RNA sequence: UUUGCUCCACACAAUAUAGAUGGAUACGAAUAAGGCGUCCUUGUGGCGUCGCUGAACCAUAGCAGGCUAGCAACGGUGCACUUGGCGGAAAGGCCUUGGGUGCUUGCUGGCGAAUUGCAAUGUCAUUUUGCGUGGGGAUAAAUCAUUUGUAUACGACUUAGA
RNA sequence: GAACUGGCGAUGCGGGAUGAACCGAACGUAGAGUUAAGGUGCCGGAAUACACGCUCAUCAGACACCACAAAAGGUGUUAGU
């Protein structure tokens, strides 16, 4: 859906042999708290020997964007499962916030590789603080000095089923 | 002789371009394009008309012929200051586009007595114009 | 809203226009479609010629006379595409289809009337620039229509007469606009401007 | 009985003193002041039909004098208020009708 | 004047139906001018008359009326649902019909 | 074939309506281009303006739209004529000259309206036919039967016969 | 030819165009409202909705059961290592 980012902090259940476990923390892009906690336990079952019955979640907090009106370039490292194997990819997206960047990332992977939400693993997402570290041409195209371009062929959708003059596509 | 081309210019999208929000929650106010995200969407701000600073798809706005000076990525205080300095609100209001919008909403706001009044006045004006249509 | 709606078929897409027009007839609007030779079909001319040859193969084996009839005129091609979208085998479908007449060119009942377009079926508004399209008159005369040039000659004559009409209309409207501008800025003009007219 | 007392005035458009249903009118924004008219005389018993027997059948085929000078009393007080703002007499004399392109959900009355 | 119309024109489109089963008790009406349910909400509760003619004079007239009312909106495009005292005869699919302005809220 | 047939006008009946209820309101071409106005050296020309929908334009007041009076203009519109054209794709329509006549809400007045009783389509459209008037217009063929054989199972076809 | 369960047989209804078994849901006679599975260009009730991409096929493709296609290739095009 429209994604939100949460921090989820959890731990193992405390025993007498070891009280105070190590309080692992992860950042999850998810639609809501339930999906966020499910993905948290999914990745902790991939990492450490723990499961939901043997552990607990001590905190979940929404992390909204610090500057939601700054235009950033993000580099995203992704695992995905194809029909024959597992691959790593690095894609970079020029967008205004992290949740919108990963939303366009999920759309981009589903469009160009037919990869689903169950197949995509988000390794990391990070803002590229400096230009000329941008490595893709499709985003390096929009970083030029005095960028301007026209929008040819305007199509205006009509409300009536009949129009009384030939329309114009000037913009 | 000299070489002749048809130039065919139209309404470039860049910083400082004034746009009119077509649909949405604003839906009819003016904004200024602050920066360009990608081919299909831009970051705009409309601080005099009360449009919050936001990223928006280019299909939800209409570009106007108005342009003024901004550096890219300008914050809303600078956007409002340059908007007031270039004074593009009455420059928009002087256009026939805004006059058409104002005419449409005035005709929508007329009542039945005012519709009777414009019918009487239109009959009087039609009488004098068709009287003028007999000498030329 | 109108008694009869006259649609200029030039530059329109066949299927999208037919799906607009069939719903208009089923709702009860009378439609006449003129200039059927200038419809457009998306795709290559060779693709649509191959499509028509695949349609032309189909006939009843034991008697070709009772088989599917392959009509060759552009108007009858449009009629086929529209009869596909009207449930023509019922009385409601027949009553709908008798509210339609489709013509090549603009006949003398309709050359003095007003032609409209359907903007959601126009080729310049629907297709991406770069996609290839066909002309229905060219495809139809490739598959056997005999009257492509006589329609062109009649259309040239009609366009000459219509330009002669339009010159007089433009001169008259410039006189009327001049008189309206000179009779503006009076008291009734300012009161009408305050009231929105 | 939840009805509205209305008048034309009868000199303007020929509508007499009458009562109508509130669900069968449109309240326009045009307002005149009716202070100075003594309408407390009229009530539900003022309009009586004098119901007809079943024997009296009209095979093929009048007005109260009290009603006609009551109308003449009230309408001369209304038209004095009508003469202040222009074109109200013409507006009340003209009829209302829907033209082509009139959308009543968008029209303001 | 030359116009005396105090109603809104509409078209009787069809019955309420699924893909293969129709229901004659609820008719579907296209009111002209309205293209959204929010504008169609103005017309709820208004009376509808289907006015037709017959050869045989019944009580002084050769014109017969079928009365009904608007009940709810239908779809996203301003079609409304209408119920009548006797259902519409289904040969009137595409026939004109009158939506009156009473009972008015304005 | 006992006064029949067609057209025109209204008079009354019948007959129905795939569905009037202000107006189908006429360039062509392009869409990575145009429209309109203006100017010139008339062009793939210069300059200005417009679009961002018909949410337009025209029409629109009067007993379902009456009866009258005046002012101002010499306009606008309807009807029956009338002069001249143009239109063959399915022309059956478009334009125009002249006079008549009616209305005019361009402006200002006078009289009428009720009782359909608090709504009831509250009836005003066009399609076909018949029968009457009274006014024009014109006075045929086909088939069976007979015959032919360029035809033919029979029908049909091709011929002939005051 | 066996094991566990659910069905059809014995069962109509909405969807899968069509079908014993699939999906949804099981049934007195009616009214109103809301939905399931499935859909909303037209047939056909319902957005020619919104948003991001991809594809142009001189046999495109279009939805589980289900009404088929493989190995091997292609400076076609897109995204990656």
Swiss-Prot record, chain A:
As for subcellular location, the record says:
Cytoplasm
Cross-link (Glycyl lysine isopeptide (Lys-Gly) (interchain with G-Cter in ubiquitin)), chain numbering: 124, 130, 148
Tell me one GO molecular function of this protein.
Answer: structural constituent of ribosome
Q: Which GO terms describe its biological process?
A: cytoplasmic translation
Keyword Cell wall biogenesis/degradation found: no
The answer to whether UniProt assigns keyword Ubl conjugation to this entry is yes
Q: Give any Gene Ontology cellular component.
A: cytosolic large ribosomal subunit
Q: Which UniProt keywords apply?
A: Cytoplasm, Isopeptide bond, Phosphoprotein, Ribonucleoprotein, Ribosomal protein, Ubl conjugation
Main localisation: cytoplasm
Q: Which Gene3D superfamilies does the record associate with it?
A: 3.10.20.10
Residues annotated with Phosphoserine modification: 31
Mind telling me which PANTHER family this protein's record contains?
60S RIBOSOMAL PROTEIN L18A
Record-stated family: Belongs to the eukaryotic ribosomal protein eL20 family.
What interactions and quaternary structure are annotated?
Component of the large ribosomal subunit (LSU). Mature yeast ribosomes consist of a small (40S) and a large (60S) subunit. The 40S small subunit contains 1 molecule of ribosomal RNA (18S rRNA) and 33 different proteins (encoded by 57 genes). The large 60S subunit contains 3 rRNA molecules (25S, 5.8S and 5S rRNA) and 46 different proteins (encoded by 81 genes). eL20 forms multiple interactions with RNA and proteins in the central protuberance, connecting components of core functional centers that are located far apart.
Q: What else is known?
A: Present with 54300 molecules/cell in log phase SD medium. There are 2 genes for eL20 in yeast.
Which protein is depicted? Large ribosomal subunit protein eL20A
Q: Organism source for this protein?
A: Saccharomyces cerevisiae (strain ATCC 204508 / S288c)
The major lineage groups are: Eukaryota, Fungi, Dikarya, Ascomycota, Saccharomycotina
Q: Which gene encodes it?
A: RPL20A
From Swiss-Prot, chain C:
- CDD domains annotated for this entry? Ribosomal_L13
Question: In the record, which residues are listed under signal peptide?
Answer: none
Its post-translational modification remark reads: N-terminally acetylated by acetyltransferase NatA.
Subcellular localization? Cytoplasm
This entry's Gene Ontology molecular function terms read: mRNA binding; RNA binding; structural constituent of ribosome
The principal localisation class reads cytoplasm
What GO CC annotations are associated with the protein?
Answer: cytosol; cytosolic large ribosomal subunit; nucleolus; ribosome
Kindly give the InterPro entries that the UniProt entry links to this protein: Ribosomal_uL13 (IPR005822), Ribosomal_uL13_CS (IPR023563), Ribosomal_uL13_euk/arc (IPR005755), Ribosomal_uL13_sf (IPR036899)
Q: What's a Pfam family in this record?
A: Ribosomal_L13
Q: Note the superkingdom of the native organism.
A: Eukaryota
Q: List, in alphabetical order, the GO biological process terms annotated in this UniProt record.
A: cytoplasmic translation; maturation of LSU-rRNA; negative regulation of translation
Q: Where is this cross-link: Glycyl lysine isopeptide (Lys-Gly) (interchain with G-Cter in ubiquitin)?
A: 175
Q: Keywords for this entry?
A: Acetylation, Cytoplasm, Isopeptide bond, Ribonucleoprotein, Ribosomal protein, Ubl conjugation
Task performed by this protein = Component of the ribosome, a large ribonucleoprotein complex responsible for the synthesis of proteins in the cell. The small ribosomal subunit (SSU) binds messenger RNAs (mRNAs) and translates the encoded message by selecting cognate aminoacyl-transfer RNA (tRNA) molecules. The large subunit (LSU) contains the ribosomal catalytic site termed the peptidyl transferase center (PTC), which catalyzes the formation of peptide bonds, thereby polymerizing the amino acids delivered by tRNAs into a polypeptide chain.
Family, according to the entry, reads as follows: Belongs to the universal ribosomal protein uL13 family.
Q: Which NCBIfam families does the record match to this protein?
A: L13_A_E
Could you tell me what this protein is called? Large ribosomal subunit protein uL13A
Native organism is Saccharomyces cerevisiae (strain ATCC 204508 / S288c)
From Swiss-Prot, chain D:
| Location, primary (coarse class) | cytoplasm
Provide the protein's localization.
Answer: Cytoplasm
Q: Which GO terms describe its molecular function?
A: RNA binding; structural constituent of ribosome
Q: Name one GO biological process term.
A: ribosomal large subunit assembly
Q: Which UniProt keywords are listed?
A: Cytoplasm, Isopeptide bond, Phosphoprotein, Ribonucleoprotein, Ribosomal protein, Ubl conjugation
Q: Which GO terms describe its cellular component?
A: cytosol; cytosolic large ribosomal subunit
**Similarity section:** Belongs to the eukaryotic ribosomal protein eL6 family.
Q: What else is known?
A: Present with 38400 molecules/cell in log phase SD medium.
What is known about what this protein does? Answer: Component of the ribosome, a large ribonucleoprotein complex responsible for the synthesis of proteins in the cell. The small ribosomal subunit (SSU) binds messenger RNAs (mRNAs) and translates the encoded message by selecting cognate aminoacyl-transfer RNA (tRNA) molecules. The large subunit (LSU) contains the ribosomal catalytic site termed the peptidyl transferase center (PTC), which catalyzes the formation of peptide bonds, thereby polymerizing the amino acids delivered by tRNAs into a polypeptide chain.
Q: How does it assemble?
A: Component of the large ribosomal subunit (LSU). Mature yeast ribosomes consist of a small (40S) and a large (60S) subunit. The 40S small subunit contains 1 molecule of ribosomal RNA (18S rRNA) and 33 different proteins (encoded by 57 genes). The large 60S subunit contains 3 rRNA molecules (25S, 5.8S and 5S rRNA) and 46 different proteins (encoded by 81 genes).
From Swiss-Prot, chain E:
- Which SUPFAM superfamilies does its entry note? Translation proteins
| Entry keywords, A to Z | Acetylation, Cytoplasm, Isopeptide bond, Ribonucleoprotein, Ribosomal protein, Ubl conjugation
User: Which superkingdom does the taxonomy of this entry point to?
Assistant: Eukaryota
**UniProt key word Cytoplasm:** yes
> PROSITE patterns recorded for this chain?
RIBOSOMAL_L35AE (PS01105)
Cross-linked sites for Glycyl lysine isopeptide (Lys-Gly) (interchain with G-Cter in ubiquitin) = 46
Q: Which residues carry this modification: N-acetylalanine?
A: 1
User: Sorted alphabetically, which InterPro entries does this protein's record hold?
Assistant: Ribosomal_eL33, Ribosomal_eL33_CS, Ribosomal_eL33_sf, Transl_B-barrel_sf
**GO MF assignments:** structural constituent of ribosome
Q: Which GO terms describe its biological process?
A: cytoplasmic translation; ribosomal large subunit assembly; ribosomal large subunit biogenesis; rRNA processing
Its cellular-component GO annotations read: cytosol; cytosolic large ribosomal subunit
| Ribonucleoprotein as UniProt keyword | yes
Cellular localisation:
Cytoplasm
Q: How is it modified after translation?
A: N-terminally acetylated by acetyltransferase NatA.
Q: Name a Pfam family for this protein.
A: Ribosomal_L35Ae
Family label = Belongs to the eukaryotic ribosomal protein eL33 family.
Q: What does this protein do?
A: Component of the ribosome, a large ribonucleoprotein complex responsible for the synthesis of proteins in the cell. The small ribosomal subunit (SSU) binds messenger RNAs (mRNAs) and translates the encoded message by selecting cognate aminoacyl-transfer RNA (tRNA) molecules. The large subunit (LSU) contains the ribosomal catalytic site termed the peptidyl transferase center (PTC), which catalyzes the formation of peptide bonds, thereby polymerizing the amino acids delivered by tRNAs into a polypeptide chain.
Q: Which HAMAP family match?
A: Ribosomal_eL33 (MF_00573)
Other comments on record = There are 2 genes for eL33 in yeast.
Please state what the protein is called.
Large ribosomal subunit protein eL33A
**Gene name on record?**
RPL33A
């Amino acid at each position: 859906a429209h994604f939100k980012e949460y921090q989820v902090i959890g731990r193992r259940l405390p025993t007498e042999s070891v009280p105070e476990p190590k309080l692992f923390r992860m950042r999850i892009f998810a639609s809501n708290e339930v999906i966020a906690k499910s993905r948290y336990w999914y990745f902790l079952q991939k990492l450490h020997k723990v499961k939901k019955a043997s552990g607990e979640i001590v905190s979940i907090n929404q992390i909204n964007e610090a500057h939601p009106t700054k235009v950033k370039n993000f580099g995203v490292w992704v695992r995905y499962d194809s029909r024959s194997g597992t691959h790593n990819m690095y894609k970079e997206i020029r967008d205004v916030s992290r949740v919108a960047a990963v939303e366009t990332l999920y759309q981009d992977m589903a469009a160009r590789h037919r990869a689903r939400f169950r197949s995509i693993h988000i390794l990391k997402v990070a803002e590229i603080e400096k230009t000329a570290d941008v490595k893709r041409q499709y985003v390096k195209q929009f970083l030029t000095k005095d960028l301007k371009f026209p929008l040819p062929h305007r199509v205006q959708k009509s409300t009536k089923t009949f129009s009384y003059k030939r329309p114009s596509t000037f913009y | 002789t000299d070489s002749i081309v048809k130039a065919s210019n139209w309404r470039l999208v860049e910083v400082g371009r004034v746009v009119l929000i077509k649909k949405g929650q604003s839906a009819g106010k003016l904004a200024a394009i602050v920066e360009i995200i990608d081919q299909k969407k831009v970051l705009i701000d409309g601080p005099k008309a009360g449009v919050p600073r936001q990223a928006i798809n280019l299909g939800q706005v209409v570009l106007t012929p108005l342009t003024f000076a901004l550096p890219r990525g300008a914050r809303t205080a600078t956007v409002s200051k340059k908007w007031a300095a270039a004074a593009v609100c009455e420059k928009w209001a002087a256009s026939s586009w805004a006059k058409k919008i104002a005419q449409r909403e005035r005709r929508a706001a007329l009542t039945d007595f005012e519709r009777f009044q414009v019918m009487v006045l239109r009959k009087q004006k039609r009488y004098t114009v068709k009287k003028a249509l007999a000498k030329a | 809203v109108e008694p009869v709606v006259v649609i200029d078929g030039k530059g329109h897409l066949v299927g999208r226009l037919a799906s607009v027009v069939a719903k208009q007839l089923l709702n009860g609007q009378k439609i006449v479609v003129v200039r059927a030779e200038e419809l457009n079909i998306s795709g290559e001319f060779f693709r649509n010629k191959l499509k028509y040859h695949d349609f032309l193969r189909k006939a009843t084996a034991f008697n070709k006379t009772r088989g599917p009839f392959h009509f060759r005129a552009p108007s009858r091609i449009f009629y086929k595409a529209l009869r596909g979208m009207v449930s023509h085998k019922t009385a409601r479908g027949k009553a709908a289809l008798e509210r339609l007449k489709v013509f090549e060119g603009i006949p003398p009942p309709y050359d003095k009337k007003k032609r409209v377009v359907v903007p959601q079926a126009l080729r310049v508004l629907r297709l991406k620039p770069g996609r290839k399209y066909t002309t229905l008159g060219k495809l139809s005369t490739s598959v056997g229509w005999k009257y492509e040039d006589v329609v062109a000659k009649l259309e040239a004559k009609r366009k000459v007469s219509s330009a002669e009409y339009y010159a007089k209309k433009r001169a008259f409207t410039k006189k009327v606009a001049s008189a309206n501008a000179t009779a503006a800025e009076s008291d009734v003009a300012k009161q009408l401007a305050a009231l929105g007219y | 009985d939840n009805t509205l007392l209305v008048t034309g005035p009868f000199k303007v458009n020929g509508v007499p003193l009458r009562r109508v249903n509130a669900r069968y009118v449109i309240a326009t924004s045009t307002k005149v002041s009716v202070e100075g008219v003594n309408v407390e005389k009229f009530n539900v018993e003022y309009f009586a039909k004098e119901k007809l027997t079943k024997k009296e059948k009209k095979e093929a085929n009048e007005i109260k004098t009290e009603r006609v000078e009551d109308q003449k009393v009230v309408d001369k007080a209304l038209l004095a208020e009508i003469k202040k703002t222009p074109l109200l007499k013409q507006y009340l004399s003209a009829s209302f009708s829907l033209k082509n392109g009139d959308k009543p959900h968008l029209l303001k009355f | 004047a030359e116009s005396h119309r105090l109603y809104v024109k509409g078209k009787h489109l069809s019955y309420q139906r699924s893909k293969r089963v129709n229901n004659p008790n609820v008719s579907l009406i296209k009111i002209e001018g309205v293209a959204t349910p929010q504008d169609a909400q103005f017309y709820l509760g208004k009376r509808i008359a289907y006015v037709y003619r017959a050869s045989k004079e019944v009580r002084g007239s050769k014109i017969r009326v079928m009365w009904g009312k608007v009940t709810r909106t239908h779809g996203n495009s301003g079609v409304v649902r209408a119920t009548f005292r006797n259902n519409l005869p289904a040969k009137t699919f595409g026939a004109s019909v009158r939506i009156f302005l009473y009972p008015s809220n304005i």
